[PDB]
Structure formats: structure tokens, C-alpha cells
Amino acid sequence: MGQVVQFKLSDIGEGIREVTVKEWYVKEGDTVSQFDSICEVQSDKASVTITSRYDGVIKKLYYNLDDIAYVGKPLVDIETEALKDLE
């Protein structure tokens, strides 16, 4: 009801190098699907992919395939069923 779950860069530590998005399959104001992942980042250390597992509404996206995200702050807000992930 009116609430959205936000995804934040996770993979690196709060002080080390940041990571860029390798795959983007969503846009601001766009909806996601179980097959349509939101953002995917890959680092020399490990590769992380963010799936949906459900259909949600994405309102804004700041980081792109070229931009780097930092741990400690959300990057995108999406509406999805209560997930342990964020919650």
C-alpha cells in the first residue's frame, strides 16, 4: 500500500572500490517481472545479479550500465511483495 522496496548496491564494502552495473532491464516508472531482472553488477571479486521473483513497479533509476554504485545507500525504489531481502 503505498510502499516500495528499494535496492541498494551490495557486494562491496563501505570503503573499498565500488561496482558498476553490467545489465539493466528496467527503467524509471517501469514495471518488473519474475523474468525481467532489475539491475545486475559484476565485480572482479564476485558477480551479483538482482532478480525480481515477482512483478513490481520501478519509479526511478539513477545508476546505469556505466555508473558505479556504493554500499550504504539505496539506488532504486520498486514495489514488490514483502520480501525478506529488505525486509
From Swiss-Prot:
It is found in: Mitochondrion matrix. The modification N6-succinyllysine is found at residue 73. The modification N6-lipoyllysine is found at residue 45. Transmembrane segments: none annotated. The branched-chain alpha-keto dehydrogenase complex catalyzes the overall conversion of alpha-keto acids to acyl-CoA and CO(2). It contains multiple copies of three enzymatic components: branched-chain alpha-keto acid decarboxylase (E1), lipoamide acyltransferase (E2) and lipoamide dehydrogenase (E3). Within this complex, the catalytic function of this enzyme is to accept, and to transfer to coenzyme A, acyl groups that are generated by the branched-chain alpha-keto acid decarboxylase component. Forms a 24-polypeptide structural core with octahedral symmetry that represents the E2 component of the branched-chain alpha-ketoacid dehydrogenase (BCKDH) complex. The BCKDH complex is composed of three major building blocks E1, E2 and E3. It is organized around E2, a 24-meric cubic core composed of DBT, to which are associated 6 to 12 copies of E1, and approximately 6 copies of the dehydrogenase E3, a DLD dimer. Belongs to the 2-oxoacid dehydrogenase family. This is Lipoamide acyltransferase component of branched-chain alpha-keto acid dehydrogenase complex, mitochondrial.
